[model samples]
Target: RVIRVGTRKSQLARIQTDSVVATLKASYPGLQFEIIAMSSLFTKELEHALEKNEVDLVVHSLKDLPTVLPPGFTIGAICKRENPHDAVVFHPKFVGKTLETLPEKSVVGTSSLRRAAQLQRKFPHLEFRSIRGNLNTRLRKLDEQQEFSAIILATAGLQRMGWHNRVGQILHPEECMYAVGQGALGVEVRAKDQDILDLVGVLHDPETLLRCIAERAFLRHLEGGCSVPVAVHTAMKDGQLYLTGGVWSLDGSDSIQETMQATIHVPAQHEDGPEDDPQLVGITARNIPRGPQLAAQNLGISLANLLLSKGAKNILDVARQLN
Candidate 1:
């Protein structure tokens, strides 16, 4: 059977879709496939098509997806993540310079409230300003204009764009924590569609799924979004999940963060059956034990709760009111 795939139409998105389809075709040679591109602005249009059965699945950068999915939909698979850190792309004039070595008063550009929030405190000498447009457009703005000394972008996106040379530095976690699911791709599908779920489940990466679940749970619990500064860094050790969740005020001052870890069980690999499937944070992974998924999810909520009790909402409220 042929699977209908839908995705955002940005140049980078097309590259990601190409990468995913490349894997699926090779993994299941028996299946045929078709792809449809929709405007990047309205991801809902792709979902609308899904509601009407126009496509079997939609591909998304996991970070952009909401923690609370709209009813009737779920992420069937989360592909393995790449580099999940924020990257600084320097202007041509500063060829090999880093964020630290750049001249004081340099204007750093970024479209995310989260990016600007963390950087302001880390590099107080440099000024952070909001910059808009897609990946290509943002680069052009920095290249042609004297206004920006550098801009912040997610490292995964640049790699997908095949523009590795453009990355001046991959911001260390101590410098800037990344968005939840920043380097992962989520394959969204209808919640109970057994066949479609199985088809995409082949692409699920056990570790990525668990890490992102913790991240998403933290964000969703705090009710965080683009307008607020919520960031995360996750890692695994001895099959235990380590999740660090943070909440910051608009200026990056007065922040609260905490780290937590929980034991988990992830399978070496995967496979079938609709009735056997259960979900966590809008995701489905067949081989992984549900109890461990629950543990990861609980760890995220516990961290968020810890921060909230310490007045994370005050930071977020003023952040929203100011931004």
Candidate 2:
């Protein structure tokens, strides 16, 4: 059977897709594979492709995917995560200057509302500008022009494209909380595609899956989007899952943050069988077993509940009107 893997047309997108394809091919050597490149800079295009059955599976930068998908679509697998932190890329003239030391009024380029909101609060002296395009294009715009002193980008994208040298500093959680599902690759497939589900299930990483489950749930419960400044940082430590979530005003003046932790029992590893594996949805352990996935999911919702009780919803509401 031929598997049509869909991905964006950018070089970075294709490179990431190629890596996933390589893994799938390694697992099933006899199957035919096709890389179906499409202009999906906007996710709806890719979703449409999947809806029309034009592609068997779609690869996405997990951050770009909404926390909740459409009715018939589901994420089949989430690949191991990379560096989920944001990177500061300084222009040649400001090579040694960090966010703290950059000249006052220095133009910082970023397209994410989450990044801009946090940076605006942390570095009020600098100016933030909206930037878009593929990874190389953004780098070129920063390097070739005098308009930008620096820009913010995902460390994962830089590392994936072999351009990590361009990164000046890896921002800490204090500096910027990342978006939900950042630094991971997600495979989206039709809900009814059992064959595709099981095939892609092999790529899921249990730890990463749990972390993203919490993060995505947090975002979903908050009802956030680019119009709302929602951000999260999640980690698994000592058999516990901890989630730190925040909501900020567009200008970063008003915000609410909450941190919570829950103990999770990761299911023991095991082999797959038709009865045992049973194509699952959401955060099932798959090759692993049950329990912790639901715990992780609850952890996110619990955090969101705490924040909402603390007036996070009001902050988000005002932010939406202002934006």
Candidate 3:
């Protein structure tokens, strides 16, 4: 059987899709694969394809996907994540300068409000301007024009495209927390596609799944959008998941944050079953009503509730008004 994978037309998107295809091929040699790269926005077009049965699966940069998927769809797998930190790409002239050492009042280009808000608070002297386009296009603008001293790009995309050498400095979590599901790839499929779901299950990383579950839950409950300056930092250790969630005003004047953790114990029954077990993969959906997955989700909602009680809603309300 041939599996159709939907992806964006950008080079990085194709590269990410190819990586997923390669992994699947290695394990399921009998299957045929075809990549359908769409020029339109990924979330809209690719989702339509899945809903219409035009494709068997769609690959996405998790940050680009919405917290709530359309009905009848589910994220089947989350590949092992790449570097989740934001990377600074300095203009050629400032070869050795970092975000801290850049000349006072230097300009930085980035399209993410999360980055701009946090960095604005940290570097009041630098000017942050909005930029658009793919990775290469952004680099070209920074290099050819004197308009920007540096641009922020995700470390995962740079590393995936073999442009890691372009990264001047990797921003720490304290400097700028990443977006929900940043640096990870999620495979979206129809909730009823049990055969395809089981096949894709081999690619799932339990740790990444748990972390993203918490991060996405926090974002969803907060009702944040791309325009909202919401950011998160998540980590897992000793089966306990720690999540730090923050919301910021557009100008960075106001902020709200909370940190909480829960011990996630995956029930033995939920462990990966035999490679071809449909029942095993069938449980890997957002609507899983019970089990360790439910607990993982509750951990996030519980954390969000903690922050909401601390006036997170007010901060987000003001942020929404400004943006």
Candidate 4:
């Protein structure tokens, strides 16, 4: 069957879609693959359209996909995640190894509520401001307009788009934990399209899928979708799932985080057959029984509830008021 892939118009987005399309074409020579670009109102709009049967599949940044898709939609696949860390890119003239090296009160731009909220507290010397657009536009604004001394972007995205050379530093999680599903590529499809799902499932990376599952589970339990400033980071080791998820205030001054680990009951392994399985594939477990989606929601909600018990709501209330 022919597959139509829907993506956003951003250059990076298109490049990402091309990569997915290329893989699908090579893997299934007999299947036709088509790319469709849309001016989605926001990341979630594509899912809304896909749920309405407007497209066969959609590829999106894992973080941007809403915690809950439109009813009847599911993430058919999640690629092996990339760096899963934030990278700081600066104006051509500003040279620095890290944000700490930048001048005091240096203006930083990022549209991500997660980055802004997290860094604002950790890098109190730097100022966080919002700037919106595709990756290129954000970089251009930094270079041409000199509006921001630096901006935060997903290290994986910059690297995937061949902009890694421009990156200044990969921020440590202590400085800023990533939003859930960050650095991963999620393929969405109608829940009823088992055929498309099967085709797309071939692209799923088991380790990445597992990490995303726990992270998404944490988010789902929080009862807040991606619209909320939720952050998560996970690691799997020795048949155990370690989950860390939380919410932060807009100013980054307040945050509540909770973590837990569970024995991976399913004996799921990677589709690529566990490339260099590191005794612990960090966030690469996908294709678990009951589906990775269900497991993710469960893990996320469970973790979120733990955070709530530890005053996550106070952090959320403060963040909501400031944002």
Q: Which is the leading candidate under lDDT?
A: 1
Which regions of candidate 4 deviate over 4 angstroms? 43-54, 265-287, 291-298
Cα lDDT, all candidates = 0.86, 0.84, 0.81, 0.74
Worst 10 residues of 2 by lDDT: 275-284
In terms of lDDT, model 2 sits at 0.84
Each candidate's TM vs. the true structure? 0.96, 0.93, 0.92, 0.86
Ranking by TM-score: 1, 2, 3, 4
Cα lDDT tens digits, model 3, 265-321, are 533234444333232212254222235555667877888888888888888887778
**Model 1, backbone clash pairs (residues 3+ apart or across chains), number:** 0
State the displacement of the C-alpha of residue 259, model 3, in Å, after optimal TM-score superposition: 0.9
Per-candidate count of clashing residue pairs (backbone under 3 Å): 0, 0, 0, 19
- The number of clashing residue pairs in model 3 is 0
Error of 2 at 43 (Å): 2.6
User: Evaluated with TM-score, which candidate comes out highest?
Assistant: 1
